[model samples]
Target: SMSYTWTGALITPCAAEESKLPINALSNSLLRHHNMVYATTSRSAGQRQKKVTFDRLQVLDDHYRDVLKEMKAKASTVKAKLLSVEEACKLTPPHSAKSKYGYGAKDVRNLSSRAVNHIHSVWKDLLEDTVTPIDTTIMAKNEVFCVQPEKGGRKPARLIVFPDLGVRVCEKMALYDVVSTLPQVVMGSSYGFQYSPGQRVEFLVNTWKSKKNPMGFSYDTRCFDSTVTENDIRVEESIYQCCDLAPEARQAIKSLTERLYIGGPLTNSKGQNCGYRRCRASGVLTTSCGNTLTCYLKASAACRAAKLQDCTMLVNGDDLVVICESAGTQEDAASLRVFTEAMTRYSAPPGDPPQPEYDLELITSCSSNVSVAHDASGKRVYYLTRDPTTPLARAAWETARHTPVNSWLGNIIMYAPTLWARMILMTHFFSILLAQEQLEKALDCQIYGACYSIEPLDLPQIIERLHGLSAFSLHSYSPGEINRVASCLRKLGVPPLRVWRHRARSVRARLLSQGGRAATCGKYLFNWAVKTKLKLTPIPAASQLDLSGWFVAGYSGGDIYHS
Candidate 1:
């Protein structure tokens, strides 16, 4: 079956879209090449459609069935419950797409009678009719990035196809608990979303060192969501069905699988029928969960088919990294070839063919890789880092525009320990916040797809809690790490590392002058910038902060919010 069958109608936008980065007084301070930055809009959505539309052919073998049986056995150990209307409503992000009905996101959050009643009715309808395909709004996501020259200039906008607010709330009601609980339970330590940045680094390092001669590679599935077939979605539901769920929960899951999850009508933001979709909807409660399960299932089977030794996999939605014992160079290369073949046979072909990497640091997964730096004690500290090109690009965009989520803040929080994140992202964003007297303001940013309201003042405590005291005092970064950062700086036309250090000193001084939480942020966050660094210690307030559901799961398109 085709992934999509389109109508002649265009995928129109509800509002005017901005394709180029808007320059401001602070734009040049971070990125000099404003032309290099651009945001994707609905105009490029047609190109995205052509790239994602493809038929899938899957052939499940004995290995796949055996792995599925094992996974189901583990899944059966868990029991999941359906969320109530109010609970589901609370999970909705405040700025989530409003319902076609009169009520909006705020009304849903407030648990207004109208919104609650509509959600209840939607749930009832799901129970009553399990066969009708649900309606979903297909919109082009306007995301900022640096132009990839190899990709032929700017890439097209990624499409987000999701159901209405009522159905969205109903999705949470049926599957929120399942998504949050099931993956960690079934996949266990292999589930990548369960760890924080520091923990993730520790896990990768430990896994790498555990092998005699480790050969690892990241499997890249080309248009993973589009590769999903109807059978794949049903198989995901069957895995969910293995769970010990409440009667109503079971029925709701089955209904959602058949009616909504399988496939649906694709309507544009302007209420025009754009097409009919047979692929996985990018925006859904089960998107992450389904992708994680399907990817893990295929990869696990592939690992066995290739006869890879002592395989250890870390999966986060579509991003997969496997570290296994090596069988020499040529043998390992052939093994990855067989692994790729198996994955392709399962309809999850690789965009870039998997390569056998002896060095763990070179094997990038989840858009991050392990890098080394020296702590204040001169001991080697392994930390997770990624190219700062996109982060800096988005930070520049966020600085110029008043966006809903401040990804720069999220990057600072998640990549707090990284050298580039501290030197570039921190210095750049903090200076702007200080200038506007908004240091105390609570801005929304996402971590693992969940939105969080974080204050610039509270960064000292947040960093200490999430990364540790070493995040502040880390220095003497590895040459490979430094080279990557330097390359990214040049590529994005960002200010040189020396310039960032000079800027950080000024920002650090201003923060110190403010006193209170502002002073604390300066002393801890910018200690690296000063010639004579302050004695770093664990923040007293860090222990008091509630970081409970922060890194529990990935909710990238789940429309999840935490108060």
Candidate 2:
């Protein structure tokens, strides 16, 4: 409920969704073309204010201090290395934001205009200035979600805002590598995305053990980044302060906290003064990293306070899942009640509060629900899947101008096994890319902070590295998922799944008949099209825990280990 920004960006409601629309019509259409819709359940400003709005008001008692104490203990064991201005600058994406100070991401990357000097100036302002939170712009996110049984339709566009480009560059110089390397050391396996979907399931189930009344559920925060108070931001800065940084690096980090991180002005589009923000920027170098550390630290402490037995958590930012040893069913409910209260005391989330689930299958993370589905071959395959709205819309917006990181390739690789991804997205995207003759293009797709340009042929290697061998071996989708995908197709303008299947069979024949790399591509991307698939083989020349800048210095988006 960030509301629509007055940005010149026009939002047109699709004739499909009727009189229903949001901030941008084009965005609405773009998302609709992919079957993603809006959540129109409640619109009262008061309810929204209570649920989704940011509140900087909260008390910092010993519980907060206690969490920091434990994080500090683990953080002391971490040995982080700083990146030089040149090396760090080189990692900035060329398509990254252009600085109001005159340089773009490319200029910085290419070392034009003494870019290092410009970066130094930005860092100096960060060190010198006070809180100046900028305004956020609403951008329709082409993301997928799990189709819930409820009448609630689609999710709204995610709103994101980052600090200025110059400060962002300084962010890379000061903390890019830090975020890449430190979370694993501090949080260990608890660092959410380090494990694959199968691994996550196994961990939760085994953790449940023989308990008859097991409880598991994910907690959703309303606008998580906005809930980050000024003190929370300062506490995150304090955690960074414990790091062993070079003199310049230390200064840069301290300056960032005082300026961007602590709070800043909110400037709307058309350059109007919206006001000020006193929370984490939804867009920034340390956005995820900051949330990871803070949420994990706070939740971990709260779990102890609640006295939940053997409580194990899988945390990614504010989205959390707790799988713990359950007491008797009645006592478990009481304990969970306390857990809720503990979180509320810490300003965990009063609006969208924590929920407790007794069944394992009901739990979801990263917006995906894990369930067993039979493939076409009747092999029971496990995959992470959500509704195909966002990914499909994103697939529709494939581009060099504005890409949502490497998602077009990444989502296919990550969820290639899922029925929604396999039948719908994989078919649609490959068809589009094939039709456009852009299969081998090494185009720009962004990552968290870094940007990359990779060709399609190399994606197998990247996919294998990220999701393990499982990405290639899942079975075909079930009828229920297929029906949903087909419904999505009709709502949008795509042919039904059968039409996709037919085209894929034709496409599959073409790619395989070509053999070699073309066959290799066909075998991997379209394996679900036909029952008989090519025999699996090794990546002949591709071996290594790391590839040429394909994986970062030591950074994994989630569900993969970079180091």
Candidate 3:
């Protein structure tokens, strides 16, 4: 038999007959079985604090230091690369297009100036808040500038070299056509090819208008077609002179006489007609002339037979077949009009919207390989499930239990909203419990730190002597049972009951005053009291309590006990 106590009043043990009460009475018990189970299995509060100190905190500190080091190194490398590109571009020339007497000189100049100004403006804007320094050496090389020849010949054209470090220059016309080859102008291999905008280079060509001089420009631009021995030469100047005749200068020439014959009269290897009737009549001819004549007649007969078949099939068929007798004749006036109209009508606009495109012929024949089919109305139907041998017709059949509305998990859950609601509530409850457990572990460690350094003389013995201060029993019961406990505690005047009621009223008032902020403060206080023992700090006045320091002092009071 178990006795019970209500507040401070002792109650008699249950009678023998009353002890036989139904199990249903236990349903409303406020005592939490989960907390009791946890206490039985888990380590003492002090032991948990020691474990976390030796393991979790040390790993957290090491991870923070490593991450910081990596971030700093990456920032440094980006800065160095930017500096290198800037230093090399300072030596290049500017890009400009000023060809003499061009049609759009004024338009080109205005457009070019606008483009240059736009680039400068953009660079200036980027520099305002940009932490990365601009590499000006690279910028100068990238700048476009004009390079006029010292001895004037042709008008200066625009050249672009990309990046400040490269020496490759591309010459372009006013419209940006590549007129000549890209020239490499860098002196040293160490500098590499840095193409910076605006960098220009000057080169001299030997001519008034930079045109080729016939006498000075003449060079060996010939190749030998065929070789002949010294004895075979018509004019024997010397062995070396005859070593190579003036190279055959190849040129492209067109001739109307050159023709290719393809698919002409068929003949056997001996050149006679190979057809059975022709072969039987000719008795085989060995000479090319005889063979050619026989094959020609055979080909003419075959062509006539093909024409006869075409006339019989097309003209005699049920479909209309309009025929023009004239072919390749200028005097046939109606032939052109007849042929033109026939072709135009063949490609005429459709009478109605075209039938929807499909590969039905391919799909129907290979239906076993296809998983989905669209009906004439364009509704997609699926065939076959996990079972490979199931026929499409059987697979498509829906039973009462497998209606489309109930087949999917989403649909099932949505059908019974209450069940889903209960699941969500349970999930939230468990998640909160897990979070509270983690917070308790963290607060216990913090308290342990404070307690180790606390002076026993200054603190009250009640505070210093409290063991299991971080542990509290969680009571869950019906509203009626909660009200009964409240009434009992009210009569007893227990310290916790007064503090709980007072705090509850204070929280309600705060929430009514400032809504979200006051609610957050209430939640913080609840978490703090459950995870660690509360320590009260007396403030000098109500005005002082309203300050930020008072809040900090309240938090620090419990923290100091642990140290």
lDDT of each: 0.90, 0.60, 0.19
Error of 2 at 88 (Å): 2.0
lDDT of 3 by residue, 1-563 (tens): 00100121111111211111122211112111111111011112122222211110001123223433332233222211111112211111122222222312232334454433433343333333222211110000111111123436221111110111111110011000100001011011111012110010000111111322211100010000001111111111111121111221000000000000000122222323311110111110011111121122222222232231111001000011112122323322233233223222211111121121122111111111112323223454322111111111111111101221111111111111111111221122122323333212211111101112212111112111221111111123233334533443233222233344344444434433444433332332232223342342321222221211111111111111211
Error of 2 at 217 (Å): 1.4
Model 2, 78-164: lDDT tens digits are 556666667666666666556766778778778886666887776676566545443332222233332433646434444445566
Candidate 1: segments with Cα more than 4 A from true spot = none
Worst 10 residues of 3 by lDDT: 251-260
Query: Which candidate has the highest lDDT of all?
Result: 1
lDDT of 2: 0.60
**Model 1: per-residue Cα lDDT over 173-255, one tens digit each:** 88999899999988999999999989998999999999998889999999999999998899899889888888888888899
* Residue 200 local lDDT, model 3: 8
Candidate that scores best on TM-score: 1
lDDT for model 3: 0.19
C-alpha positional error of residue 204 in candidate 3 after TM-score superposition, expressed in Å: 70
Ranking by TM-score: 1, 2, 3
Evaluated at residue 52, the lDDT of candidate 1 is 94
Taking all chains together, each candidate's TM-score versus the true structure is 0.98, 0.80, 0.11
Candidate 1 to native Cα RMSD, angstroms: 1.1
